[PDB]
Amino acid sequence: VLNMLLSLDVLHDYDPNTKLKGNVSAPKLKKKDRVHLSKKQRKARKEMQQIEEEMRNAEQAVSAEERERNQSEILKIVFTIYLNILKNNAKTLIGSVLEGLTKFGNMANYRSLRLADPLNNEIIKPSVNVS
RNA sequence: UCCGGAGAUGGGGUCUUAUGGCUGGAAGAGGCCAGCACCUUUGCUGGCUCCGGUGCGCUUGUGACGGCCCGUGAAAAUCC
């Protein structure tokens, strides 16, 4: 249950120019294969494209400035949970708490007894919560 | 190297007049000649100004296409 916090993407930074999945699409509709639009329709299309561009810019900026605040709040909640678990001193949760602290510590300012192995366990080799 | 049961090939028609042809303007104009007048603005007269070819040529306009980039590629006056 407590291992799901290990999968928080908001507490991860990857390489600034990571390669994503190969996506191929037509860059633009071909000029000779366009649909006829009236002058009023073409002017409306220009206007709505101008609106859409600025909406996209504003949404990008808002998402950027909200991700950091959400990251701060989630960091506070996660660290409070981890520290309260440690103060409670539960013998069956120490390894996960230490692994989470090691993973998300730099974001701040026994396998038989557990079930449902963590997501991407084939690639996420446990740094502190080893078998 | 694209089109055709989303109707090809074939047969018969409709349209835009861009651009060519003939004519009016217009030969009376302009051009090239010859001849005859005068101490002078010193101008009068008569002919011919026609028929063609050629283009990986230069300049320019235009038509149907093809490729690439891209907000379907400035706005308004104005006319229909």
Curated annotation (Swiss-Prot):
Similarity remark: Belongs to the CBF/MAK21 family.
Its biological purpose: Required for synthesis of 60S ribosomal subunits and the transport of pre-ribosomes from the nucleoplasm to the cytoplasm. Also required for initiation of DNA replication. May function downstream of the origin recognition complex (ORC complex) in the loading of CDC6 and the minichromosome maintenance complex (MCM complex) onto chromatin during the G1 phase of the cell cycle. Essential for growth.
Coiled coil feature spans: 31-76
Whole sequence portion shown: 333 to 540 of 663
Location within or outside the cell: Nucleus, Nucleolus
Note: Present with 11700 molecules/cell in log phase SD medium.
Phosphoserine modified-residue sites: S63
Quaternary structure and partners: Forms a heterodimer with NOC2. This complex may be associated with pre-ribosomal particles. Also interacts with MCM2, MCM5 and ORC1.
The protein's name in its UniProt record: Nucleolar complex-associated protein 3
